Amino acid sequence: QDLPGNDNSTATLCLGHHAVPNGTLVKTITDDQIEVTNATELVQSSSTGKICNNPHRILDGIDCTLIDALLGDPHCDVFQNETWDLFVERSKAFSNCYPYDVPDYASLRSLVASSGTLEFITEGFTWTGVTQNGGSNACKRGPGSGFFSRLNWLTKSGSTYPVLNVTMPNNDNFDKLYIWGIHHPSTNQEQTSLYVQASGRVTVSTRRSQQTIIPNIGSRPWVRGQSSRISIYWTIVKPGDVLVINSNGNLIAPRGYFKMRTGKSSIMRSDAPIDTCISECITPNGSIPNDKPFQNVNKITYGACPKYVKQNTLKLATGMRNVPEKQT
Amino acid sequence: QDLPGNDNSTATLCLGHHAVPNGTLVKTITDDQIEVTNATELVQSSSTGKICNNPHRILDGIDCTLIDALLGDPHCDVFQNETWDLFVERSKAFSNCYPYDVPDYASLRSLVASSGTLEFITEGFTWTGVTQNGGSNACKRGPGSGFFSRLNWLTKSGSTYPVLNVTMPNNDNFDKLYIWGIHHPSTNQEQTSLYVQASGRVTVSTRRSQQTIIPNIGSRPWVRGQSSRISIYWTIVKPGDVLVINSNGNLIAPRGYFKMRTGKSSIMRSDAPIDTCISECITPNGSIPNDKPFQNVNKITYGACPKYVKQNTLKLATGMRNVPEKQT
Amino acid sequence: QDLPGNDNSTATLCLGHHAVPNGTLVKTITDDQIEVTNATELVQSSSTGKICNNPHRILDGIDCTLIDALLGDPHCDVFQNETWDLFVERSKAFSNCYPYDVPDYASLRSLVASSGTLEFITEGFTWTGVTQNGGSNACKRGPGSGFFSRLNWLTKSGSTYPVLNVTMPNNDNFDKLYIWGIHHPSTNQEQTSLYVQASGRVTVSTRRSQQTIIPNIGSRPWVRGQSSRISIYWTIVKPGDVLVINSNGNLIAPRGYFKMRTGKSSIMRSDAPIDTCISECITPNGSIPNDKPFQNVNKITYGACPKYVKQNTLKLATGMRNVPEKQT
Amino acid sequence: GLFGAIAGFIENGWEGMIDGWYGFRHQNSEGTGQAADLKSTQAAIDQINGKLNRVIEKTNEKFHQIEKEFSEVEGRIQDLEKYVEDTKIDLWSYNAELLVALENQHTIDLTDSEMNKLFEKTRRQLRENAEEMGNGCFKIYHKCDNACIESIRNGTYDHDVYRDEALNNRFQIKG
Amino acid sequence: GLFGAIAGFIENGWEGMIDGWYGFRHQNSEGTGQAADLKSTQAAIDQINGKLNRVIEKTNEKFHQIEKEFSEVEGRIQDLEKYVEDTKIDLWSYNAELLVALENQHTIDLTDSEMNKLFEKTRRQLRENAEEMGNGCFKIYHKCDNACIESIRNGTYDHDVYRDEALNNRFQIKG
Amino acid sequence: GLFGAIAGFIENGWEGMIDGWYGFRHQNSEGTGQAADLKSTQAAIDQINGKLNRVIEKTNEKFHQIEKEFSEVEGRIQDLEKYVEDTKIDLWSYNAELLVALENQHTIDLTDSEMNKLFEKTRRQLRENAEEMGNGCFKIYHKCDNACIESIRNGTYDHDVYRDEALNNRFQIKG
Numbered sequence A, B, C: 001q002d003l004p005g006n007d008n009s010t011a012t013l014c015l016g017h018h019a020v021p022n023g024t025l026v027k028t029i030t031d032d033q034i035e036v037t038n039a040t041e042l043v044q045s046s047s048t049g050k051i052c053n054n055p056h057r058i059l060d061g062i063d064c065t066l067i068d069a070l071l072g073d074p075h076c077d078v079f080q081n082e083t084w085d086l087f088v089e090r091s092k093a094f095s096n097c098y099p100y101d102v103p104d105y106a107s108l109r110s111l112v113a114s115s116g117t118l119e120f121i122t123e124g125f126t127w128t129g130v131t132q133n134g135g136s137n138a139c140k141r142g143p144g145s146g147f148f149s150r151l152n153w154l155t156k157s158g159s160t161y162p163v164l165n166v167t168m169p170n171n172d173n174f175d176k177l178y179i180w181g182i183h184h185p186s187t188n189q190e191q192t193s194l195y196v197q198a199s200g201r202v203t204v205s206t207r208r209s210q211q212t213i214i215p216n217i218g219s220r221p222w223v224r225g226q227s228s229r230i231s232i233y234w235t236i237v238k239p240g241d242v243l244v245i246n247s248n249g250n251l252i253a254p255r256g257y258f259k260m261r262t263g264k265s266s267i268m269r270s271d272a273p274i275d276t277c278i279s280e281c282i283t284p285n286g287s288i289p290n291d292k293p294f295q296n297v298n299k300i301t302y303g304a305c306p307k308y309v310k311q312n313t314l315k316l317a318t319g320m321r322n323v324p325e326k327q328t
Numbered sequence D, E, F: 001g002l003f004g005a006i007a008g009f010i011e012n013g014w015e016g017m018i019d020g021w022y023g024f025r026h027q028n029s030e031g032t033g034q035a036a037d038l039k040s041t042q043a044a045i046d047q048i049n050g051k052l053n054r055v056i057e058k059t060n061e062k063f064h065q066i067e068k069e070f071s072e073v074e075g076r077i078q079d080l081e082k083y084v085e086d087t088k089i090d091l092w093s094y095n096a097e098l099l100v101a102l103e104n105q106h107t108i109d110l111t112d113s114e115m116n117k118l119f120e121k122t123r124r125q126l127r128e129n130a131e132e133m134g135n136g137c138f139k140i141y142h143k144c145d146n147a148c149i150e151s152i153r154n155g156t157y158d159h160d161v162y163r164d165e166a167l168n169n170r171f172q173i174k175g
């Protein structure tokens, strides 16, 4: 094509790849550690230490558990009608009112925690022939003795206690949660003094369920001056159904209903400080970022969080094999 | 080899692959959508809308739930001794007999639904000194008042109600399921009228278990004229054991046993029409074909069904990369 | 470079791989069976048939279940204060003392089995005004009639069964497990003979929980001469809390506490012989080696065991494809 | 893909090839023409069906299970029933998503591989008589009529027959 | 890796190449010199980001679940709550562990592949004018000045231009 | 497999090779010989043990779990206990089944790759002195005695030594 050259030589062309002096070992199908040019961590292993107050409604329980906030322990009266995406229970929380127990506490803490609202509606119940508004020095409200703001302790009028038999229709289009209870006196004398009859009974029913509890008389350990206990129970009433409360003693009556809603609310136990920042994944240890696919901070999470894993580091190689010349 | 030719020429041979004008995008490890020549859907996402009546015994409950079919609500008397691979409960189903409740309804619906048979054997129980066959206008059987076909309501004889104490040995080689109950009167007068004693008791035992229920007196919501309730209970009796029923009031007695069997029977809630066709995978939405490995129709399935998945399409490439002549 | 040679020839070099005459078929992503030169089994499918007595403390229950060993059936008195990593229950095991039942037997078998110790501490309870140490001919201890070594059957002293009301503080720094019970008499005469009052009651409480049981009078099936039953219950008492036992009849009192510990102990039902060898993975079928990653011997395992799988063989090819020239 | 033939050194596919997945196009002194390769097409198809069947393999049948829909609020045990099924579903969803991602990746490289193996196999057969124009086309340096092209394709081409012609014709020095 | 280029027939990497992942060093008529290849660097980088994004894809959000820590001993139902979560965790841990093992394996072979494809692509372009020294270096048998080297690298080298020179220079017989 | 060497361009394996996985057979002036290649045998063996150990890695130990066998009919909670374990087992069974399928696939291509790499490596060393007969055999175009064969195999063959001989002997035109 061109003409005979007066020179005759050759050239060398060599193909090659880069290499870095440092380089990270990564796991393989055939190798446990092999060095690549670069990698990324896929396990998130540290929290900030604070629960960010944004985007979810984080309600600090402070020294109230959700059940005392529900029942209306005087010292928790601050939470009335509160609302939350996450209720945080603090380990410092205490109760300070009449000694109660909740047989199946765990479901009541769950189904309220998921509802996410404490909106209470007072209904006009009529208790005929009994003394309303009983209270106790084990639950002071101010200088006075008192009781849970949402429950009504019925004792005898004059010298007798009738068979209470009341009804409250669910005429609304939503479910109504009713919290009620029963008082287990310490002695047979306490029983007859307060409720006249030697054995009370509570039957709370809807047309689809019924529960009858009879009180249990006996000494229990002194808690705030009391050896008696009240035990808490719940009844959900579906739209169009009816609540019927029948009792001839020891009833701790409801003052109306809590609204129930379907939501994304939950409860968490954490003593992490709440601080102002935005983060979607919350953990009892504080928030964590959700840029990585797996996390190892805590298996308890709320929100858009990485899948919890056992491993605390898992490196995805984002580079070729590192085969250095000069080395590190 | 051959001799010097008079023509001198060359040829061109080119290797290549096909390509299609259309082509499907598919997911990869390194790509979210990349186009291949052809693919297949692995997620089954549509139902026919009908439950095929073949190969499984599908029993339409029509307007009977399995528990009313078990107890023998008059309107469900059609199901006596029926048998099923799948009992279908319809949402239209109602009850129409004495108001009852089943504490732990959910296990009784389960363990009957799995047994798959309602075969009942009447045993000759002898109730001495009580009036048998009580019924109620809340459960009409024909023009008359009546009761569950499989339970026997015992009321007093004139003046008295004795302590019933009866036995029925399990002499067969299979387990026997006994369904029984107790009546919770609305008033103390109802109690004494029917059962004489002011408080009844039921203890039902085998030599390995015992349950004592005491009735609960109180007003409940009017359901079919009644404010009283009966509550249902079950006792399985293993071969060679004994049933002993002891009671001095409020017993709703068994009339014999249901056979229990080990099977592949279950229950499903569906208003899908049953139609004549054969299909192995049933879903509340109707049957679905099980040619694909995953399905997205419903997480509730019965039979040979695809694994339910969240994705609603997942395409497996069954062809090479599509690189068309005038790129698409 | 070198000088012109007088010979002109060529050579043949051929590259190749080995092949074996035998060769194993293995599964692939594109093939169900393809033959490779060699493979390894990854599913462990056989047991030795014996539970090796090493490294874990395997306690043979012989003819005692853990609950009878706990309660102190005379024939199980051998296990007092025993300790285990694995308690093995034998199917031959029987009970031979007063007929009892444990409502929620399954949790009591669990929480003791996990604690791993039966260390019992006798506490000085004072039962005032009642006769201690009752026993029964249905539970002989030696020629005499007797009762569970760890429970104390209280019957009235003279003309009275007083209201027992006793306390035992948890002053130690560990949790104490108390096992107690209640006696359900066969007849109303048995009730009044033993406990005077026509209806006993037991309330056992801590300052955080309370349970009241009332007895259930009625005939049950004859078991070792008895138609009565006792039912067992448990109360854990946390450090610094108090047990309070209040009763006016039918109490089967505790004689002190079992220590509870956090461990790696469990219970297993197996009639496999225990033999002397060391093995880490135990299965009801005997020990199995844990060199393979998956096992198919039994889904019930204790210790360092392979993940149970449904497959009974899964061969990992450890060689190239086998392409023989002769074949067979 | 891994081998760099499909969508690599072969700039694009032929929509015209309706009779096979891989094949040949030639221009020789008789004319131009095209033909599908059936052995490599069958090789790619068999492996793809192989994996397709293993995926379409045995559905497991399940009968009485747990309830997955509830009409009342119950609390603790229902919370668990919901958690067991929701965690089962996310684990099976992950599983289907990784399966088709791995599978699809492997199918694009498998068919990339078969294109490359046909090419290499053809290269070895032509020995010193052809040169790679580097775009999937070999230039054959000797008169190759249609029977010559059929022998290459059906795999019976004898390179020695035309070696001296091709070689002379190839290492011509003249510009 | 599978192709045997990186850590294979190319004895090692160049720490000196700060401008790309694959590239050329040359020795020639007017010096020595090096240059990153950007098309193969971008190809390796795009695929690695491709998989990286698919892994960094959607976190699932969960709200009210089951309790994972307990303060009292309850027995049967708590035993189950613990078993459900412990088995969920080991299944997800296995899952992350297999994912980065497969992924890492594939990334080392993918970048091995791109080294090999650049090499092969360069080979095809030089036609009969260069020989493979078998160490990643081609010996070019004709005077190739810096523009000649830039045409090879930018992919426009015309082999015919220097074929007679190279060929003559290559099949010299003289010792 | 992906590279088309084993069960590909190498028609079959040698049952005779008892001393290694890959190797050479030759005919030369001094007679015929066979010899295992140890570097490629060790390479294939090391990778296969590599994966074998990662699979034989840590068994997890579990102690008190949930009950998996029942003697009475209980209903709701037992139904759940059964569902949790049955879903755990199918998830682990799927897991073992995909693991050995992926693994086995990769092992057949890994050993396919090593055959190919030995072949290619040998090719590069022979430079212009041999031609590929396309069946795994190189035809060497110069007298290559047993030391010549040992230098190719131990990797010290100097192609320049025999280039003029081979080249002359190769591009003979005479029929």
Ligand SMILES: *[C@@H]1O[C@H](CO)[C@@H](O[C@@H]2O[C@H](CO)[C@@H](O[C@@H]3O[C@H](CO)[C@@H](O)[C@H](O)[C@@H]3O)[C@H](O)[C@H]2NC(C)=O)[C@H](O)[C@H]1NC(C)=O
Residues within 6 Å of the ligand: A186, A187, A219, A220, A221, A222, A223, A227, C165, C166, C167, C242, C244
């Ligand atoms: C049944 O037995 C229990 C224990 O013997 C009796 O309980 C004890 O009752 C006294 C008052 O009668 C309680 O005293 C007060 O305790 C607080 C806390 O230390 C202290 O601040 C007060 O100044 C006073 O000492 C004592 O704590 C309480 N102990 C327990 C464990 O509850 C109970 O009275 C008996 N019941 C009957 C009806 O006999």
Ligand SMILES: *[C@@H]1O[C@H](CO)[C@@H](O[C@@H]2O[C@H](CO)[C@@H](O[C@@H]3O[C@H](CO)[C@@H](O)[C@H](O)[C@@H]3O)[C@H](O)[C@H]2NC(C)=O)[C@H](O)[C@H]1NC(C)=O
Residues within 6 Å of the ligand: A165, A166, A167, A242, A244, B186, B187, B219, B220, B221, B222, B223, B227
């Ligand atoms: C306890 O309180 C409840 C509510 O006050 C009382 O229940 C009510 O009793 C009357 C009959 O005495 C029921 O009337 C019936 O209504 C239906 C529907 O129209 C009708 O078909 C009947 O002919 C009859 O009129 C009323 O529905 C019922 N309400 C509820 C919610 O159950 C109950 O009587 C009180 N019990 C005692 C013992 O005082």
Ligand SMILES: *[C@@H]1O[C@H](CO)[C@@H](O[C@@H]2O[C@H](CO)[C@@H](O[C@@H]3O[C@H](CO)[C@@H](O)[C@H](O)[C@@H]3O)[C@H](O)[C@H]2NC(C)=O)[C@H](O)[C@H]1NC(C)=O
Residues within 6 Å of the ligand: B165, B166, B167, B242, B244, C187, C219, C220, C221, C222
């Ligand atoms: C309530 O009804 C049951 C059944 O009718 C009565 O139980 C039976 O009572 C007799 C003794 O009175 C038991 O006899 C025993 O038989 C065994 C075994 O053969 C023998 O070893 C003993 O020496 C004794 O004689 C009989 O087994 C028992 N049957 C059952 C199923 O428990 C019970 O007495 C009635 N109760 C009342 C208070 O009326």
Ligand SMILES: *[C@@H]1O[C@H](CO)[C@@H](O)[C@H](O)[C@H]1NC(C)=O
Residues within 6 Å of the ligand: A038, A039, A040, A318, E052
């Ligand atoms: C390492 O990889 C990550 C993800 O690809 C990337 O952000 C980072 O820049 C890489 N490092 C270097 C030095 O390229």
Ligand SMILES: *[C@@H]1O[C@H](CO)[C@@H](O)[C@H](O)[C@H]1NC(C)=O
Residues within 6 Å of the ligand: A080, A081, A119, A120, A121
């Ligand atoms: C709670 O909400 C209800 C409904 O709006 C209202 O009537 C009631 O007074 C509220 N109570 C408080 C303390 O907010």
Ligand SMILES: *[C@@H]1O[C@H](CO)[C@@H](O)[C@H](O)[C@H]1NC(C)=O
Residues within 6 Å of the ligand: A045, A046, A047, A284, A285, A296, A297, A298
């Ligand atoms: C998170 O919290 C748990 C429980 O407090 C603790 O065991 C764990 O180590 C913590 N992890 C981090 C990263 O803080």
Ligand SMILES: *[C@@H]1O[C@H](CO)[C@@H](O)[C@H](O)[C@H]1NC(C)=O
Residues within 6 Å of the ligand: B038, B039, B040, B318, D052
């Ligand atoms: C696409 O793939 C499926 C499964 O391999 C097959 O049935 C169908 O025929 C394929 N399409 C074409 C056009 O080959």
Ligand SMILES: *[C@@H]1O[C@H](CO)[C@@H](O)[C@H](O)[C@H]1NC(C)=O
Residues within 6 Å of the ligand: B080, B081, B119, B120, B121
């Ligand atoms: C139910 O089956 C039993 C056993 O064969 C039989 O005696 C009984 O009469 C049957 N009842 C009906 C309505 O089929």
Ligand SMILES: *[C@@H]1O[C@H](CO)[C@@H](O)[C@H](O)[C@H]1NC(C)=O
Residues within 6 Å of the ligand: B045, B046, B047, B284, B285, B296, B297, B298
């Ligand atoms: C199936 O049924 C469920 C419940 O009725 C519904 O949410 C779902 O969308 C249905 N899917 C199909 C494919 O019909």
Ligand SMILES: *[C@@H]1O[C@H](CO)[C@@H](O)[C@H](O)[C@H]1NC(C)=O
Residues within 6 Å of the ligand: C038, C039, C040, C318, F052
């Ligand atoms: C087969 O593979 C296993 C694991 O690599 C090994 O122990 C055994 O020796 C191999 N068999 C042969 C014949 O090499």
Ligand SMILES: *[C@@H]1O[C@H](CO)[C@@H](O)[C@H](O)[C@H]1NC(C)=O
Residues within 6 Å of the ligand: C080, C081, C119, C120, C121
């Ligand atoms: C059980 O252990 C306690 C604590 O050491 C001891 O006092 C008691 O006597 C022991 N009983 C037996 C039979 O070992």
Ligand SMILES: *[C@@H]1O[C@H](CO)[C@@H](O)[C@H](O)[C@H]1NC(C)=O
Residues within 6 Å of the ligand: C045, C046, C047, C284, C285, C296, C297, C298
């Ligand atoms: C192990 O034991 C179970 C239950 O006894 C039995 O079904 C299974 O077949 C046994 N397997 C072996 C390998 O012994």
Ligand SMILES: *[C@@H]1O[C@H](CO)[C@@H](O)[C@H](O)[C@H]1NC(C)=O
Residues within 6 Å of the ligand: D146, D147, D148, D149, D150, D151, D154, D155, D156
């Ligand atoms: C290949 O084609 C030639 C003609 O070019 C024919 O003679 C020969 O028989 C064919 N061989 C095969 C195996 O088809």
Ligand SMILES: *[C@@H]1O[C@H](CO)[C@@H](O)[C@H](O)[C@H]1NC(C)=O
Residues within 6 Å of the ligand: E146, E147, E148, E149, E150, E151, E154, E155, E156
């Ligand atoms: C390649 O380099 C040459 C000089 O060697 C230049 O003339 C030509 O334009 C370049 N082509 C491209 C596409 O950069």
Ligand SMILES: *[C@@H]1O[C@H](CO)[C@@H](O)[C@H](O)[C@H]1NC(C)=O
Residues within 6 Å of the ligand: F146, F147, F148, F149, F150, F151, F154, F155, F156
């Ligand atoms: C290779 O073989 C030759 C003889 O052909 C011998 O002289 C040389 O030392 C050997 N080299 C190695 C590295 O074994």
